[PDB]
Symmetry: D3
Subunit: 182 residues, 6 copies
């Protein structure tokens, strides 16, 4: 934001109760929702209609961010949260990391964390200890989704590099948390 011009609901949510391993995710896009991309406006405390997805492709898992984090790209750490039923847009969930999906787009690197709810919240996912426990068919779907959903956004492209584990996820959380407080 420009000098001249520069002259709550989200930013007051703790990044996590016990970082980096125990963190909070505000949901922006439910799994399987109609192909509209919402992005939290953290100044306004509201979800903003970002884009009607050109390919009409839908998020195969829930999509959100960790409040009070600032990633290298200037946005909060992004998280995919797997659940047995879609989560409400604008809700918050206690989560734990399984790893990450490494990718780069026309603008630089872009990693999305892969997460599940805390075990007490979601017993259905407690079995998932790391990225490699996530079913092959689903990891494939997610990789395909990121490779293709922006196929019809002019000037954009996405390349998926592959997966990473929990340390890598935690470093991302660690650094994002740091950056947000300068």
């Amino acid at each position: 934001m420009g000098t001249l011009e520069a002259q709550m609901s989200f930013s007051n949510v703790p990044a996590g109760k016990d970082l980096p391993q125990d963190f909070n995710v505000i949901i922006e896009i439910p799994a399987q929702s109609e192909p509209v991309k919402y992005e939290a406006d953290k100044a306004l405390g509201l979800l903003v209609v970002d884009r009607f997805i050109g390919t009409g492709m839908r998020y195969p898992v829930n999509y959100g961010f960790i409040p009070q984090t600032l990633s290298g790209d200037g946005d909060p750490v992004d998280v995919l949260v797997i659940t047995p039923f879609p989560l409400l847009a604008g809700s918050v969930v206690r989560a734990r990391a399984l790893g990450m999906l490494k990718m780069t787009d026309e603008s630089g690197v872009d990693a999305k964390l892969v997460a599940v709810p805390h075990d007490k919240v979601c017993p259905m996912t407690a079995n998932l200890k790391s990225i490699d426990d996530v079913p092959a068919y689903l990891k494939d779907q997610i990789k395909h989704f990121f490779e293709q959903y922006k196929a019809l956004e002019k000037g954009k492209w996405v390349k998926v590099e592959g997966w990473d584990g929990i340390d890598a996820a935690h470093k991302e959380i660690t650094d994002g948390v740091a950056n947000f407080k300068k």
Copy 2:
């Protein structure tokens, strides 16, 4: 509100980035949602259950308002926002005007602006330059909806007078913006 008694989430959203032509709409009622009327409480920053619609008729397009506007009737400027998928109640969208629907009810005039998302947000609607580009079948549906949805609200009635264009829409935005700051 009475003298004796008179002794954020919505009202801090800018009316628009470049008024009157580029404005923001907070969504109250998604297109095709079950026949319950919500109204934003701008004091409380929450959607309020206003009415279970007597006829059970549903909004054929998304319905919302422009924050920080005050129309002659004492409420913000109302907007119908056409999209290819319903929008989330309580989300905000960047919009542009196509015109208006002129009508009057038992309480006086009532015009609803007709709008679509900004072109970058919704490429699907970029083709729509003015009210006359909106399909006849849909304009008819909208006119019918406003004529009939309140058919079973005792003491109420609505009469649709016809359509108007972008200047008329902009004047409404212009005046609403002015009124809100006294």
Copy 3:
């Protein structure tokens, strides 16, 4: 909350326009929603994913709370709100009491108020004057739901004791309102 650590959107909603008989309910769980339990975080002003319900059972009526009340268990007064269509999670509704469902769980007593919207809001429910007007099949469903939904939460149990009327509901509202202001 511990001494050491202790060193808006919900709590600024009035408990009611004319207590105890005319009160407000913020909706946490819509009737018939997928089996995920949300709980309002009144500090954060957001709905939190509380639990994926083990039995996968769904709320047969809308579920919420009255802001600015504090019940003996340390939480706001809980309310079941019957409507002909599910209400939006995080919306507020003007309600009136029909009575209560008395029950106890592993932690102590737990009563849920049973309510409907104000007559002007919902003409469909205006016929319901007291708990005994609520259809037998539905009261049975609600009692069954509370008896069984937590069947697969380890260490938990719920026993339903039976119904009570409007005075009992009002006393609950009365006391909850009092407790919240010390």
Copy 4:
């Protein structure tokens, strides 16, 4: 069908186990379904897309017909079936009559029977003994729906005359059954 040209799944369903009081209804349009009108093709044994409803108005109750009946207008006896959840299009339900809605359109009289499932099938509706037990708000909605849904079908109109009871319903069933066998 013309002489020259004239040279199972539905027509083999009994009209009823104990006519006229105990009859069967094949569902064509579920309550609250998207505004598309289906009509059973009794020759082909399939539902046919009849019309995208111009007003976009939806059936407030389930809509179907009694197989092996032929009403004066050349079609089977029509039935509105009230249920607590919409019924599957193309399913069959055991029903009992509450009465009828008398109306006429541009083509002549048109009465729709009003029905509910057999008590053992639907205990929720067992309380409804006659047309006058059906809630006022719902009867009003149904009358409004028939008055308005065809508002935007060119050359069509519908006028609702009022209600009738079970004898009238039974006579309709009685005659329809007779006519179908010459």
Copy 5:
């Protein structure tokens, strides 16, 4: 059916391409559908509205039967089919057995087969080789569902005895197939 009275779409579907291990299931009730019980009428070739479930509980997995089988209770072999998205009521699916749920009701034994689609049809479930691979939380849900869904059907009760494996499933298929041809 009585002597005096006794004087296609389903019954012409093969029980299986390679019995007992490779069999067909016609779906009657999709997983998570609204709490209405459908039952295929094999004489009429249509789904019949059987019951509005008193508890309002929903099937946690898809429910159907194997055509051209006759189980001891006089009905076809029943099957629960697990899939990542609910299946269409009245569709047919190629399936393979994982085992069975043994239970008895007021009328005698009642076993439900547990199945998944053929691997080529559903790669998502190919990992499931036997009943013990099905997640604990889901088996628990299914057992709870059968224990409770009929809680409010007067005169009925269900007791779940426990699980069994593929041989037991196959014997059920084997015998059902035999019985159907006398």
Copy 6:
């Protein structure tokens, strides 16, 4: 089907009332339905669960076939039917051609016809006279969908060659109709 082994509901539906221009389409997959591929079994008269789509991608328009046609690949002529609301799986619709999408897969050519309902059925689409009237964003989505939906079916691939008009569509109908009667 092999010699040794070779020793209604769909095949008795006319291909069209006035071929090739006025034809019938039986719907197999509704627009926007969950990512499960159904295929009509024309022997059995039922929809069969064909595949859980690996990419989880959904049909952006309705998908079906013209009964009593046999295309070069051994299946009926395939049709994409555009409508303002998804159509019921297993319903039949009166349609007219806009053109075709030419593509080839690992098995040979594969063209899908693009169609809309008859004007009287769907006034919303009457404006569409040819393939070039279909919005660019939608044609792009459809082309992308066919290019990518099978990305995760092992051994499969699809290449889209481009569009064709009504004569080409009609020839396809013409030949398919011929082939079906030897």
